[PDB]
Structures are given as structure tokens and as C-alpha cells.
Design a protein around this ligand. Structure first.
Ligand SMILES: OC[C@H]1O[C@H](O[C@H]2[C@H](O)[C@@H](O)[C@@H](O)O[C@@H]2CO)[C@H](O)[C@@H](O)[C@@H]1O
Ligand SMILES: OC[C@H]1O[C@H](O[C@H]2[C@H](O)[C@@H](O)[C@@H](O)O[C@@H]2CO)[C@H](O)[C@@H](O)[C@@H]1O
Ligand SMILES: OC[C@H]1O[C@H](O[C@H]2[C@H](O)[C@@H](O)[C@@H](O)O[C@@H]2CO)[C@H](O)[C@@H](O)[C@@H]1O
Ligand code: NAG
Ligand code: NAG
Ligand code: NAG
Ligand code: NAG
Ligand code: NAG
Ligand code: NAG
Ligand code: CL
Ligand code: CL
Ligand code: CL
Lengths: 417, 418, 420
């Protein structure tokens, strides 16, 4: 007889497949994601780059008559008339020497450049670094790469480019980390007679721990370290991965570097800051990339400093960056003990040829290492991929192919006639 | 060749048992009301800057303590053993004992009305005197940007309380520039001499600070962090928004549970509310920093009932004042660091600017920077892992597999069974 | 033969089903995991153990002529000739007493033991502890357990297994925690005339907050606390649970307790370090477990310190520890204020019978407590278990079987072709 039951079942089988495909395909277009977390003790962890700056930008003994003439006003050492202000806070022979230095009678100005000034007058790592050790191995001034920041001449440990085939840490604790003893040299601090962006009321250093493929932004993001203490910095590397649209909203540039090889929030901000200053001040500050001419002291005071301050303080629209797809964050827990103890003050004073009082106001020890659970990952993952879609329809699709197959083994003869 | 009949018969049966087991196991799972906690850490824009409350560790300014104050609160502050003997304890500042011995002479003195709130409000440190400089995102702030708030430390101040005005302060980029920077003078010259150990006296110098959501009251004596004079302290933060699910899936309490003294539910609001009811019931008074309208405890009540009662609650209590988890919580992760102030090179400038000795600057001035790091926003939210719609979808998919498999049977066992 | 359009149906049929099953089965064999996170305010949270050490290892007043003879060089107080270098080095007050104590004229060395020296000369909790309060209740020296570490004689508050009820925290804040005031006693600090693993340029204490079943490794993992400040340590307990193979690479506390009842990274490191030193120096440092003989001060300087330093600084393969399946981490946020204020110095000086100057250079207060959200859990869970696999492809691998039988039962009757 006539069995419509077969044509009805075939339709159903196709109908069920249509619904499953529509449902699963709709969910797929929602491009959902899941964030996977894990916190473990990784081995062979790559030690980061560590940048540090003295809070004092220019060494008093390195400031010359010509430097004073050109940048004196910027440093608040001279008034708008090339003269020492009514601010004479130096009952010492520091004012005396400064007045001789400020004597411009018959003085002939010589060429001046801010970058050269920072490079020449900035604190010298060779003098600041009293000792340096990384995982039991002694490091020297040469292990530090010079990098210019808003603080001027700063230094980066393990910047990555030398030999030492990637520095790594294996265990938790100070032993597997970096330990440095520094002399901040307050005797070389520039007298502070006013408040300016280059002026500092504080003594110590600013530090920033960051990935080697990310430039520092130490004036904004660094942490402080005070003289007279041994500071312990226990860290945890946190690797965050994000997804680009339609899943997420991150971004990731390719090899080609407008200024920086890798994309990061800092690289983006510095890039944007530089273009903003070049456009508005027709010059770049000494710590900025590119080839525009460096700003003169006058431009720093009249345009550059106020322009950058606007960007890092008030701006809400000019330099806003998009999330990178790859970010490395370093969680840190800081603590400190006093240096020197009464029992070691004499030993340190003699060793470095300083008074005991000096040691207590200038020496600092900094330990940067990782805790046992040194590695955490937070990665956005695609929740419903193709393999997941096909798998979700494969089951129902099979039953349909089967019905069609059984339809073939049922009409093979009739069809063949 | 009859086996080809039982095969499609067993398959159908099996396909039936599978539909049953899977569906039953998924409805049971549903009734376990499971949850998933979703985590995401990003760099948010237009982040709302939190409220920042701070208190001087010294509760009463020496120069503002009068004869009447000493008469009423001298015992509480450990400055007097009784009202008939003259103080004789040497003070760091020699002139303080002399002034104290004169203020302590009550012979022929007529006591005037006294109030602890009035005393705190009048003798507590003045923000207009402590605040040397204040800047938020490049803009200069002033004492008026600070709202007076009473805590267990007495008269304290909150920056960006969000009580008055309207202009919501926002942060956009990571770093000190997008944050708050304040320079304070803690005024140790105004610190009351410490001659005994009480809950109102302190061995320390500096301030206590608490960064909190604007809709959450502070609990600074318990949860604040310290900031020391002689340093510039950097506080790099990260906002963490946590969302919890109610009783079925979780065990939180809607931040709208019959608002008592506060309109938003938080652990702190709950603790303060509970503490207040405890004190009003057991002491018949409330401390100056507590809400409500109960009478304010007198100095006598502070010493005899209030301090002991509040200490019991924040230290020993395990049952009286316990709070349920709120469904909405905002935590601020913080990383602190510091550098020294002043440098030898700036000490003279600061001394001259504020007419103080260089030594004074070194023991009283501090600078505090509160800002956010690049990845300023983290979210940790509990979500229902299996809702009804999800259960239906799964059941619908299972039936789809059932019908699909059974069709092969009806089609191969048609001629036979029918 | 047009029989292929019949042989393909069975093969194609078993193809799809096989594909659908292999998909989830291959996934199952990857043994995927999911990490569940939660952060809450737990009630009756178990307070951790808190270990602390003075940065100075030996009290000047407790050093004897015989201690000086045996440990002098190790402490840099004597040169390799048993003599005190150029007098112009330290306080003449201490120099004199030290010169007298160093006078070895026809002196006969008596037996010496480093453990005994640390125990006798190390700082005494009875002297360092000025006050101690836990949740409003006074604690005392008897509340601290002695524990030897590389810093020498240290102390642990709430070590546990002390026959007392478990200490618990219920609310956030300083009130529900520990507060201790210590005197670091710089007047007892050994003069420093050189740099050795046993000398310190710093003054203060080292502290380590840890679970009671985990030994301390304070020289490597502790945090510092400075004199002249009240330090606040706001904590959050974080419980991490990991899965063993094939899901993960963690190892649980199985077998016997070679040295410790529970497994932890620190227990593993201390065990390994001990074995390493016994092998290379045939002795163990005072803070190590076991029964090997204690290294002499000469062995410390010539073999032990260099050996341990190698392990904690340079080694990359000798002591590699596996991940525990259970870990408790304590996140912490530190802050501080100054002590004493100008207004409280006299009171403290009088109360503890010390000069005002002494108070400012030796006293410190430490507060260890938990924030409101005191408990975080991060646990690895199995993502795809057998029941889940069967729930996904139970029907497919079921039909595949039937199709297979139906197939074997097919080409079988096909064997009929043999006749012809
Ligand atoms: O990659 C995500 C995807 O993984 C698994 O699919 C695997 C499959 O199990 C393997 O046998 C092989 O075919 O590679 C596939 C991925 O390309 C999961 O089964 C699937 O749900 C998931 O989406
Ligand atoms: O049938 C095999 C197939 O079962 C599951 O796919 C389900 C899906 O998860 C449901 O949401 C709904 O769409 O029904 C589908 C089955 O028809 C497994 O998730 C999938 O991996 C498996 O291949
Ligand atoms: O019982 C906890 C368990 O429930 C669910 O696993 C189910 C599965 O979904 C069903 O299809 C069937 O196989 O029974 C299983 C339980 O025995 C959840 O999917 C699973 O995550 C959860 O642990
Ligand atoms: C993220 O960048 C780091 C280098 O900083 C690299 O090692 C890692 O593989 C990257 N992750 C991904 C998947 O892009
Ligand atoms: C030590 O410092 C003094 C004073 O500045 C100086 O005269 C002397 O040359 C220095 N000694 C050495 C060896 O550098
Ligand atoms: C509680 O959390 C929900 C979910 O984000 C939010 O919409 C609400 O504003 C929060 N608090 C309330 C009830 O206002
Ligand atoms: C502030 O300095 C002035 C002189 O510049 C002095 O007369 C005055 O007494 C000082 N302020 C006080 C009262 O401490
Ligand atoms: C983890 O270890 C602790 C002991 O430190 C124990 O109390 C707890 O029950 C353990 N948790 C699990 C899931 O094993
Ligand atoms: C106080 O210290 C002095 C000098 O160190 C000592 O002689 C005296 O015994 C101490 N007082 C008491 C009662 O301990
Ligand atoms: Cl910017
Ligand atoms: Cl309470
Ligand atoms: Cl080791």
C-alpha cells in the first residue's frame, strides 16, 4: 500500500535538523567568551625589566654657568632676569658657590641642549650603585641600560638585548631575585627654591617593574623607595589575554613599529603624547621617541610641561587607548626594615667614606623577587567555537543522514528498475 | 535474519532509557541551583573616583581643651586622676604642663554644660589647618571639598563624599596624574600629652585613611590603613566590583533590606547599625559617631559603658553583631610605597613657606597620593549556571535525538510490526 | 557491481557516528579542567600562624669567650687568626669588652655547638615582647613557640597543636586580629665589621604569616617590619585547590611524613636542602630536621652557607618541587604610622624604663588582621567526567554498536556469494 509514514518521517528528520542548526547557529553568533583563571608556581619564569630613577633630576656639582643661564629659570634657580631670586635657602656655602655660578657679567652663552643636559647632569649609575646581585651573581653598572624618562636619566636592569640568554627565576624568595644597594646622593640634590615640574620635595627613587617589551611610564606608574630602609618587593606575574571583536574589544599591532614593536597601553600613551606635543609645541621632550627637535628650556616652561601635564592629569579625550590583547601585570607586596642598624652604621660609613648620619639619609637596599605562586593567568577564551558548533549539530545531522541512507537502501531496486 | 528486528528494537529502548537518564540528571542538576563566577580585569574609562576619608591619630588639639573640658573629660583622657589634685607629669613641651596645671585648678570653678559631640567638633583637628595643598587631576581642591564625618577617632574628613553638589569625579588613565594628591601637617605640637592608656589616646603619630564607595560609610578605626609623617605615600589602586546571588543560588542580602540608618546595605552599615542598637540598649546612649537620635554618651558613660561595649563588639563578639553578605560589594585593591619628605635640599624651602623649623617639617608633613593603575577595574560576578531556558534547551535537544533515532526504527520496523 | 552504493551507506553511516563519538571522546582524554573562583566574608575563619625573627642573630651580652673563639670568624668579629682587626672599627665601649673577651692567652677551647649557641644567645621573647593582644585578650611569651630558622632563634604565634581551642576571626579589622609591641633591642646587636651570611646591615624583624601545617622559610619569603613604626597588615586568606594527574601536576600528602605531616612547597624545599647539605657537607644547619650532626661554625663558613646559598640563589635543577594539591596563600596590604609621637614618648620611656631615644629606635607595633572579604577560594574542578561524556555521545556510540552488529550481520549473509 501507500505509506505516507515514510515521507512524514523524512520531513520530521529534516525539521529536527533545521531547528538544531538554527538554535546552535544563533548561539554561535552571540560570540560568547569565558575567562579562564589559574594561579600556579611556574618554572623558568622570565624575570622582568626593572627601571629606576633618582627623584633628583640634576646633580648640583654638574650644573655649569651655561646650564644655569639657559635652564636656571626652569629649575627655579634664577628669576626671569637671570638673577638669583629672593629665595636664598642655603645658609651653607651652597649659595655662595651658586652666586659665583650665576655671575653672567661678560659671560658668552654657549650652545645648550636639554637632552645633553640630562645626560651630563643626571645621576650616574656608577656612583649610585654600591652593590648589585641577581641570583647569586654580581651585576655591575654595565648591566643597566640608560633610559630617559620624565625624571631625566634613569636606568633599567634586564632590559633585554645584551647576552645573558634571558634571565629567569625558578624558586620563590629573595634568593632568586635582584638585590641592589644604592646611594641616592642628597649631597648632589639641586637646591629647591620653588615648585616646578622638574622640582622635587622628596628624596629617594622611583621604580617600575615591567615586561621587557613595554616601555616605562615611571613618573605616572612607578612606586617609591625611601632612603634609610631595605625594601622587600614580593611579586607575582599576572598574564592577561583578551579577545578582539566580535568576542571582545582588544587590539594588537604587528611587527611594524611606529615607535614601539609591541602594542601596550604605555606604548600607546607615549606615542599619543609625542604627537600631541609635536603638533602643539613643535618639539618633543627628551624622553619622547621620534626625530622632532627637542624642546628648549623655554619651550618646556611655556608649552611642553603644561601640555604633558594636561594629558596625564586633565585630558579625557585626546589620548585614550584601546585595551591590548596581551598584558603582563606584576602584583606587588612591599615591606621594609631600617638601614643601617646602630651596630652597622660605622662599618658602612667607613666602607663608603661617609659620615654615619649620611648613610642613614642616603643608603637604601632594594630586593625584588617573586613569591612561590609566581604566576597567574587570566585569559578570555572563545566559549563556542566551530568544533563546538559542528559537534552540537553533528548528532542530529547523523540521524538525518541515516534516514536518507535508509531511504536509499529502500529504493535501490525500484530506482534501478 | 530476525536479529535485524531486535537490533532496531533495542536501539529504540536504549534511546528511550538515555532520554530518561539524561533529562532526569539535568533537572536534578538544575535543582542544585549552581552558579558560575565570571571574572574580568580591564582598563575602564569614566571610572568613578572613590570617597577618601582620613583622620588625625590625635583626637583633641591641646590648645582647644578648656577648663570645662578638662573638668568633664579629664578622667577619660587620662589627664586627671581626680578633680582635686594638680597634674605633675613632665611634658615634651615644658609649657604644656604649666597650662595644664592652671586649667586643672577647679577651686571655685562652676561646671558648665558639656557635650562630647561639641567637644570633638570644636577640639578636633581642623582641615583648614592640616591641609597644606590639595590637587585632583590637575585641579586645586580646598578644605571645602572635604566633608566633616565623625568616626571613633573623632572629627575626620571625607574627600569626594558625593553627599552635596553633583559633579561626579572620574578617572580615565592610570597613574598619579589622574588621582588625588594632598599634603598635610599632622600638627604634633597640638597632640595631647599621653599619660595613660585609653581608647581615646594614641602612642602613634600620623593619620588613618580609608578608601571606600560613596554609598558605604567608613569604619576607619577597624579597616583604615595608616600613613606616616615624613613620607610621601603612593597608593596605587584597582576597583573590584563583586556581585553575589541571593539565597537560592547564593546567600547574599539585597542592598535594600529595609534601610535603617543608611539607604544602601553594606557590611559596614550593618555593623554600625548593630553597634548603635547594642549601645543604646546597654548604655542608654550612643557614641558621637553613631546615627539615630539617642542621647550622646557623656565622658562618664564613654569610660564606664560605651568604650567597653564597643571594644567587646569589635574584638570579642562572635554572635551579637554578625552581618550577611551584601549582594553588591566594592573592594579597592591597594599597593602602597613611599619616599622621604623633605629632602635636605627642600627642607629649608618648606620650613620657610609654612613658618616652621626644618625639624618640624620632618616630623609633621606628609604627602599622600591616591590613584589607579592602568588595569583599574576588575569584576567578579556570580551568575546562574543553569537557568530554566537552559534546561528546556537541553531537554529539547535530547528529545530531538530521541525522535531522530526512533524514526530510524519506525522506518525499519514498519513492515514487520505493522 | 552497483553494490557499492550499498557498501558506502554502511561505511558512511559508521563514519559519521564514529566522528561524532571521537570528537567528545578525544576531548575527554585531554582531561580538561575549570577553575572556580569565589571571594566572600567567611565566618569563624582559622587565624594563621605568625612567625617572626629579630634581624640580629646573637645578643652581644650573651657571647662568651668560647663562643667568640669558635664563631668569631663566622660573625666577622675575628680574622682567620683569631684576632680583632684594627681597633678603630666599633664603639670603644664594646671594643674593650670584646678585646677582653677575645683575649685567648693560653685559652683552652671547650666544646661548642651552634644549636646551643643560637638557643642561648638568640633574642629572648620574654624581653622583646612588651605587649601582646589577640582579639581583646592578652597573650604572653608562653603563647609563642620557639622555631629555629636561618635567622636563628625565632618565634611563632598560634603555631597550633598547643592543646588550646582554635583561634578564629569573625569580623574585618584590627579588633579581630593580633597586635604586638616589640623591643628589637639594638643595644644587644652584635657589632658588624664585615659581610657574612650571619651579619645584618638592617635593624627590625622579619615576619611570615603562614598556615599552621606549613613550616616557615622566613629568610626567603618573609616580609620586613621596621622599628619606630606601627605597621598594619590587612590580610585575605586564599585557598587554592589543584587536581592531580591526568588533570593536573599536583601531588597530595600521600605516603609517610619523611619530615612533615603535610606536603607544601616549603616542606619540600627544606627536605631537599637538608639532603643536599648532608651529602656535600656531611652536616645540617641548625634549622634543618633529621639527625645528622650539626655543622660547626667552620663548616658553616666553608661548606654550609655556600651550599645553601647555591640552592636558594643559583640552583635550577637539584631542588625542584612539585605543586601541592592544597595551598593557602595570604594576600596582604601593609601600611604604617610613626611611633612614638612626641606626646607619647615620655610615657613609653617611663613605662618600659628606657630613654626616649631608645624607644624611637627600638619599639615597633605590629597589627595582623583580616579585611571584611577575608576568604578567597580558587579550585580546579574536572571539566568533563565520564557521566558527562556518556550524556553527550551515549546515544551515538550506542547506535554505532547496533550499526556495527547490523553490519557484521549484513556482510555475513552476503557470504552467501561463496556458494556461487
Ligand atoms: O578547540 C575547541 C574544541 O576542542 C574539541 O574539539 C576537538 C576534537 O575533540 C578533536 O578530536 C579534534 O577534532 O580537534 C577538535 C578541535 O578542532 C572539543 O570537543 C570541542 O567541543 C571544542 O569546541
Ligand atoms: O548528539 C550528540 C551531541 O550532543 C550534544 O549536543 C546537544 C547540544 O549540547 C544541545 O544544546 C542541543 O542542541 O542538542 C544537541 C544534540 O542534538 C553535545 O553537546 C555534542 O557535543 C554531541 O555531539
Ligand atoms: O551531578 C553534578 C553534575 O551534573 C551535570 O552532569 C550531568 C550531565 O549533564 C547529564 O547529562 C548526565 O550525564 O548526568 C550528569 C550527572 O551525573 C553537570 O553537567 C555537571 O557539571 C555536574 O558536575
Ligand atoms: C603575550 O606576550 C608575551 C610576551 O610578553 C608572550 O610570551 C606570550 O606568548 C604572549 N601571549 C599570547 C598568546 O599572545
Ligand atoms: C673621603 O672623603 C674625604 C672628604 O670628602 C676626602 O677628602 C677623601 O679624599 C676621601 N677618601 C678617599 C680615599 O676617597
Ligand atoms: C546590585 O547589583 C545589581 C547588578 O549589577 C545592580 O544593578 C544594582 O544597582 C546593585 N545595587 C542596587 C540594588 O542598586
Ligand atoms: C611665624 O614666623 C614669624 C616671623 O616670620 C614669627 O614672628 C611668628 O611667631 C611665627 N609663628 C609662630 C607664633 O610660631
Ligand atoms: C586543604 O588543607 C587544609 C589544611 O591546611 C585543610 O584544612 C582543608 O580541608 C584542605 N582542603 C581540601 C579540599 O583538601
Ligand atoms: C631601669 O634601667 C636601669 C638602667 O638600665 C636599671 O639599673 C634598673 O634596674 C631598671 N629598673 C628596673 C626596676 O628594672
Ligand atoms: Cl596620556
Ligand atoms: Cl561590630
Ligand atoms: Cl631550595
Amino acid at each position: 500500500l501507500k505509506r505516507v509514514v515514510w515521507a512524514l518521517c523524512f520531513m520530521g528528520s529534516l525539521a529536527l535538523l533545521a531547528l538544531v542548526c538554527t538554535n546552535r547557529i544563533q548561539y554561535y553568533f552571540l560570540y560568547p567568551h569565558v575567562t579562564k583563571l589559574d594561579e600556579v608556581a611556574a618554572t623558568r619564569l622570565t624575570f622582568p625589566a626593572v627601571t629606576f630613577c633618582n627623584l633628583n633630576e640634576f646633580r648640583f656639582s654638574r650644573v655649569t654657568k651655561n646650564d644655569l643661564y639657559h635652564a636656571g629659570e626652569l629649575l627655579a634657580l634664577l628669576n626671569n632676569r637671570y638673577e638669583i631670586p629672593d629665595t636664598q635657602t642655603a645658609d651653607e656655602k651652597q649659595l655662595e658657590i651658586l652666586q659665583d655660578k650665576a655671575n653672567f657679567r661678560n659671560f658668552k652663552p654657549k650652545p645648550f641642549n636639554m637632552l645633553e643636559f640630562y645626560d651630563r647632569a643626571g645621576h650616574d649609575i656608577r656612583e649610585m650603585l654600591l652593590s648589585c646581585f641577581f641570583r647569586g651573581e654580581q651585576c655591575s653598572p654595565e648591566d643597566f641600560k640608560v633610559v630617559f624618562t620624565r625624571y631625566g636619566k634613569c636606568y633599567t636592569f634586564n632590559a633585554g638585548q645584551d647576552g645573558k640568554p634571558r634571565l629567569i627565576t625558578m624558586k620563590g624568595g629573595t634568593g632568586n631575585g635582584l638585590e641592589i644597594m644604592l646611594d641616592i646622593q642628597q649631597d648632589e640634590y639641586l637646591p629647591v627654591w620653588g615648585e616646578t615640574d622638574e622640582t622635587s620635595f622628596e628624596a629617594g627613587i622611583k621604580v617600575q617593574i615591567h615586561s621587557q617589551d613595554e616601555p616605562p611610564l615611571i613618573d605616572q606608574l612607578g612606586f617609591g623607595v625611601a632612603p634609610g630602609f631595605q625594601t622587600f618587593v614580593s611579586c607575582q606575574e599576572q598574564r592577561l589575554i583578551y579577545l578582539p571583536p566580535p568576542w571582545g574589544d582588544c587590539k594588537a599591532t604587528t611587527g611594524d613599529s611606529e615607535f614601539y614593536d609591541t602594542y601596550s597601553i604605555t606604548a600607546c600613551r607615549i606615542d599619543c603624547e609625542t604627537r600631541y606635543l609635536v603638533e602643539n609645541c613643535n618639539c618633543r621632550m627628551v624622553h619622547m621617541p621620534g626625530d622632532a627637535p627637542y624642546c628648549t628650556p623655554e619651550q618646556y616652561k611655556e608649552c611642553a610641561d603644561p601640555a604633558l601635564d594636561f594629558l596625564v592629569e586633565k585630558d579625557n579625550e585626546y589620548c585614550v587607548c584601546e585595551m591590548p590583547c596581551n598584558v603582563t601585570r606584576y602584583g606587588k607586596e612591599l615591606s621594609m626594615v631600617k638601614i643601617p642598624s646602630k651596630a652597622s652604621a660605622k662599618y658602612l660609613a667607613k666602607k663608603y667614606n661617609k659620615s654615619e648620619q649620611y648613610i642613614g639619609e642616603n643608603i637604601l637596599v632594594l630586593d625584588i623577587f617573586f613569591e612561590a605562586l609566581n604566576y597567574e593567568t587570566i585569559e578570555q577564551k572563545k566559549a563556542y567555537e566551530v568544533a563546538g558548533l559542528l559537534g552540537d549539530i553533528g548528532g542530529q545531522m547523523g540521524l538525518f543522514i541515516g534516514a536518507s541512507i535508509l531511504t536509499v537502501l529502500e529504493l535501490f531496486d525500484y530506482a534501478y528498475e
